[PDB]
Design a binder for this molecule. Structure first.
Ligand SMILES: [Zn+2]
Lengths: 198, 198, 198
């Protein structure tokens, strides 16, 4: 059977986004998601379906600016709402779905890390750590001079303190370059492209 | 040359997933990945290629529910298996590829953060921190009353303890809103759509 | 209007990447991003547009190997460059855009977490924590034997120290399975596919 023009938008609707493995595009059917605009007269289905939700004006609708961004599904689906990943576990700690959701379509979220604790390098005999404690074992502390009206002294920020040339295993906090400015998984950077006209 | 119907599935095969920049779809060729079902008689190539791997039944195959989820490649490829990002570094710490992999196709993984350490706000002269230590320098500790049969006292969970109105630089632990319920990178939320019929 | 062959590449250009919800592909128009190669004579537009940027040779151009990887947009766009997510906040801490960027197209980044601090389980009266401190309140410390030429003792790595069967709420550091080998958000694993020929 021979294919007609109405099947084009059916196959890839204007408004759709995919990835692109190079730096330039071969045709004006697609545009980069780099925050430009399109002309509404040039791209009437983009103007009608997307409008100004990514900025611009009705005459020159905005394109998404996805440079630097990861993508997640909008909303919160069955893998996140399952009761078995919500509520608190047997130790009273929230399960890993709690507080995790996509936004509305087009919403941008900043980097974040879950709250979490570490066991400290000092402590005492009583079961009275401000934020919890281990069982008693081979751990240092003092028997002298304890009182309970002090400050909590902060840990450092996870970067190394001593120079690499003077460290060994026990003077090194972390896996190499794990701590930095950004929370993000292993990833490849690609361009995102959006379909704007037939 | 004129295009025939067999080239449709060639160009975008049923089973393919991309992103969508709005809240509704213009045709029934695509469906949202929101965990619905399709009819197998309506969508025979979806029924044959995908079947019940995302749930549903043979008569009404399930759609993926990608709401709230990021996407990674299934498996573990050259960027993760390269020996230069595996094994231990010169300080005995596992390199950043270790333990990092995609799952099988359709597998869902929960949020996670790598193990890591911080330098503590207290310590002693001996090279005997339970979890390691720095070199000796301008760091507080006590010379009195040490013993080694105590508990380790936990750090807090990274949220601020004192109110913003009473903090300054040194009373503030973290970058603003960095700590929260979720580990995730900077991202935009979009819909995912799957091709279900011609 | 009847559709001709030149509209194929227009609709989905060779070089485009999307996702795939199964384990095999129905036609040779697309290939998995599993690090293979294609033949340049079989796939001349792939050879001309992509060349050897993902490896291989001019005669047999390489395919991306996206197995295990997430995707982010290349570059750094308006959501990351906005002055209101850069610079330092009122406490002198860098806002959450600082240091966050996509790479060049095809660049791979390793997992990372932002630097951050926790409040320690010990401290003293003076406003002199090496890495900061809270206000004075109900916090343990010693009044005896302080000096300032010690080491900083490290925290542990966030994994639990005591066995689950012997823990309760206050002996448990973290949300269940939050700490592991990998920093990554909630996600689904899928195949990535790239368009290589008409
Ligand atoms: Zn930490």
């Amino acid at each position: 059977r021979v294919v007609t023009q109405n099947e084009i938008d059916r196959t890839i609707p204007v408004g759709a986004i995919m990835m692109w493995a190079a730096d330039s595009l071969p045709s004006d059917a697609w545009r980069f998601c780099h925050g430009g605009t399109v002309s509404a007269s040039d791209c009437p289905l983009y103007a009608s379906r997307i409008g100004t939700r990514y900025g611009g004006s009705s005459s020159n609708p905005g394109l998404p600016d996805m440079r630097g961004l990861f993508v997640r599904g909008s909303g919160r689906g069955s893998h996140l709402t399952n009761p078995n990943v919500n509520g608190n576990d047997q130790f009273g700690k929230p399960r890993l779905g709690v507080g995790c959701t996509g936004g509305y379509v087009g919403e941008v979220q900043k980097q974040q890390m879950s709250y979490h604790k570490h066991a400290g390098g000092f402590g005492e005999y009583d079961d009275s750590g401000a934020f919890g404690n281990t069982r008693r074992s081979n751990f240092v502390g003092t028997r002298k001079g304890l009182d309970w009206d002090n400050r909590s002294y902060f840990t450092n920020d996870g970067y190394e303190i001593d120079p690499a040339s003077q460290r060994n295993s026990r003077y090194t906090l972390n896996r190499p370059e794990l701590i930095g400015n950004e929370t993000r998984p292993w990833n490849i950077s690609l361009n995102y492209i959006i379909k704007v006209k037939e």
